[PDB]
Design a binder for this molecule. Structure first.
Ligand SMILES: [Ca+2]
Ligand code: NI
Length: 339
């Protein structure tokens, strides 16, 4: 049974906050994950998002495939597009109009979400606003728990590049049941919601077990431990989201937090879930907190752009980045800055 915490609406740095932050860190260090309670509005917005997802996935494939953009990676991903994995996905990135200064300047990955309809748009936006409020609480508590200035992480996540995978896993249709293989998240923080079907498994930290640093070119965590215990089944539970660290938190904490390996098993019926990714600003760089004079950085926008180009080399978004040399804007943004 996972540990469950109730986050305060505001985090100020009081004693209850520091104690809670330490408890969250301890729960990640023991279990790799914990649950946070949702109130009735957070829960309602979660359920309405799931419902919009189910309705959209019932639309014809020709329509679903049209919900794509050559400016942003937001939009529909057919099954097998992300060993290929089985879910269909609608990716929600920051929803920027063509009038936004970054979109006008052609920054890679910046553009308007190709929403299937307004009802879906409103459900996802209000859900992601609540998820973001929780992500900020969590990052202030984590900072306090490490005896860091309260805004250590949230200073990096102002206008952060938050995004969400709106997932539908098919039922099992053969002996194969690997929905998503074992891997770690490449970003900062993951907040996850699911329906009552069941399928998410996570790996807690294991004493004496070597973990790769998945942000490095020569170390990949993908596929590791897939067929070896321990894997904790994240039991569907009403009134909670789950929370686990990604690669960037492992990097910034020097391994005091480990990026939680996770995988999804196909069930005997379809399964809906939403994986929310709370991130630094596209222009922000993560850095090691506990190792001064370390020069390593993770420029988040470069990190995100490279990952999606590699995952989707043939998507129209990737093609336009190549045709228009949009990666050049990433280099230009760093010029004349202190790094
Ligand atoms: Ca790697
Ligand atoms: Ni993930």
């Amino acid at each position: 049974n996972l540990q469950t915490f109730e986050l305060p609406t505001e985090v100020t740095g009081c004693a209850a906050d520091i104690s809670l932050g330490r408890a969250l860190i301890q729960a990640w260090q023991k279990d790799g994950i914990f649950q946070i309670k949702t109130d009735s509005e957070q829960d309602r917005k979660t359920q309405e998002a799931m419902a919009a997802s189910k309705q959209f996935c019932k639309e014809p494939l020709t329509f679903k495939s049209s919900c794509v953009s050559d400016l942003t990676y937001s939009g529909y991903v057919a099954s097998g597009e992300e060993k290929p994995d089985f879910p269909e996905i609608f990716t929600v990135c920051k929803d920027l109009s063509v009038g936004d200064q970054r979109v006008k300047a052609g920054w890679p990955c910046h553009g308007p979400v190709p929403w299937p309809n307004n009802t879906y748009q409103k459900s996802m936006k209000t859900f992601m606003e609540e998820l973001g409020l929780a992500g900020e609480r969590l990052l202030k508590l984590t900072a306090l728990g490490f005896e860091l200035p309260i805004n250590t992480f949230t200073d990096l996540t102002r206008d952060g590049w938050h995004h969400m995978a709106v997932l539908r896993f098919p039922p099992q249709t053969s002996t194969l049941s690997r929905g998503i293989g074992a891997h770690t998240d490449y970003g900062l923080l993951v907040i996850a919601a699911q329906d009552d079907v069941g399928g998410l498994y996570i790996r807690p930290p294991v004493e004496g077990e070597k973990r790769n640093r998945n942000w490095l070119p020569g170390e990949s965590s993908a596929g590791m431990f897939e067929h070896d215990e321990p894997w904790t089944f994240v039991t569907p539970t009403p009134g909670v989201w789950t929370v686990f660290p990604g690669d960037i938190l492992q990097f910034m904490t020097g391994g005091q937090l480990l990026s939680t390996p996770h995988k999804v098993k196909l069930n005997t019926r379809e399964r809906f879930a939403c994986a929310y990714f709370h991130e630094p600003n596209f222009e922000a760089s993560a850095y090691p907190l506990f190792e001064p004079s370390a020069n390593e950085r993770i420029h988040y926008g470069e990190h995100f752009t490279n990952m999606f180009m590699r995952c989707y080399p043939d998507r129209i978004t990737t093609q336009r980045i190549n045709k228009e040399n949009r990666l050049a804007h990433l280099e230009d943004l760093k010029k004349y800055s202190d790094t």
